[PDB]
Each structure stands twice: as structure tokens, then as C-alpha cells.
Amino acid sequence: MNIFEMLRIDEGLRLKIYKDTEGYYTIGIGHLLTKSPSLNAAKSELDKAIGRNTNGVITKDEAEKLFNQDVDAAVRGILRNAKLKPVYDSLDAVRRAALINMVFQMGETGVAGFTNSLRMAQQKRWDEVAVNAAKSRWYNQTPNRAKRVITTLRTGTWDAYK
Ligand SMILES: [Cl-]
Ligand SMILES: [Cl-]
Numbered sequence: 142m143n144i145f146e147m148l149r150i151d152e153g154l155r156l157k158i159y160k161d162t163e164g165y166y167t168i169g170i171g172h173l174l175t176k177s178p179s180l181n182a183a184k185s186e187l188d189k190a191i192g193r194n195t196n197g198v199i200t201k202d203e204a205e206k207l208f209n210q211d212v213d214a215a216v217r218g219i220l221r222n223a224k225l226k227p228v229y230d231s232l233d234a235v236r237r238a239a240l241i242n243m244v245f246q247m248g249e250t251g252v253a254g255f256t257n258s259l260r261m262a263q264q265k266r267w268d269e270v271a272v273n274a275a276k277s278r279w280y281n282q283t284p285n286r287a288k289r290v291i292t293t294l295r296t297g298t299w300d301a302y303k
Contacts, residue, residue, distance in 0.1 A: 144212060144238045144241050145208070147238055148171065148212065151242065155167075155168065155204075156198060156199055157198050158184070158198075166182075168197075168199060169208060170204055171246070172208070174186040174190070183197070211245060216241060218249045219244055225240070225252065228240065239293040239294040240294075247279065255277070257273050258274045262294070267297075268295065270291075270294060271295040274291050288301070
């Protein structure tokens with residue numbers, strides 16, 4: 142298993158504009174288009190992202206291209222983030238994947254917000270990280286997904302995904 146397969150499982154794949162769990166316009170594999178309540182604004186963002194007049198529909202290949210970009214950016218975001226880099230540097234490969242997942246979902250700022258979890262992660266206090274990360278809006282809103290990520294972070298294995 143890997144970060145792509147992991148996120149593909151968590152976000153799913155949709156070829157038409159849709160609303161995410163928060164009600165935002167999204168497409169493909171969890172690619173947020175906009176936080177604005179307008180489908181048109183969404184259609185505009187889409188066309189600009191893809192480079193053509195889509196009419197709110199893309200192909201698989203197109204979705205996958207956005208996905209590649211998104212993963213790359215999350216990784217790059219982490220490494221440029223002062224609060225995030227060090228955590229990531231200290232982790233093993235599977236747990237890094239968990240951190241990338243969180244960043245892909247909530248953005249750098251959101252993750253940087255788990256200050257206490259991050260510190261504990263750096264100290265390798267696995268059970269404490271899991272307890273602390275669950276006390277969050279993140280966990281209350283999308284619990285099944287959050288559970289999968291937390292387990293991953295806690296155990297350092299892909300069990301939750303198999
Ligand atoms: Cl984009
Ligand atoms: Cl969920």
C-alpha cells in the first residue's frame with residue numbers, strides 16, 4: 142500500500158462536480174474547487190485547473206492528474222513548513238503517509254494546529270497521539286476516516302486499510 146492508494150481509498154473518485162462533507166464544491170479525488178456557494182464559480186475554477194471548457198465533467202486521466210499535483214503539493218507544503226518538517230523528518234514511512242493524508246484533507250494550517258499531537262508524535266508516544274488527535278472537530282465530523290488515519294499514525298502499519 143502507499144499514499145496514493147491510501148488517499149484514493151479515503152477520498153474516492155468522482156468525475157462530476159460534487160459537494161464534499163463540508164458542502165464545498167469538489168471534483169476527482171478530493172480536489173477542492175472552491176469554498177464559494179456558486180456552482181459557476183466552481184465551474185470556472187475547474188476549467189482553469191484543467192485548461193479547457195469542462196462543463197463540470199472530467200475524465201479519469203484528468204482526475205488523476207489533479208491528484209498527482211495535490212499529493213506533490215502536500216508533500217512540498219510539509220517540507221517547507223517549520224512546524225511540520227521536523228515531525229515528518231522524525232517519522233517512519235508509514236506514519237509519514239498518515240501525516241500527508243491529514244495535510245491533504247485539512248491543509249497545512251489545520252494540521253499545524255494539532256500542536257500537542259505533533260509534539261507527542263515527535264516523542265514517539267503512540268497511544269497518547271491517538272487519544273489527543275481524537276479530541277478534534279476533525280474526528281467528530283469524519284470519524285471513520287479519522288479513525289483510519291489515527292490508527293495508521295498509532296501503529297505504523299496499514300492495517301486499517303486492509
Ligand atoms: Cl489547481
Ligand atoms: Cl468518515
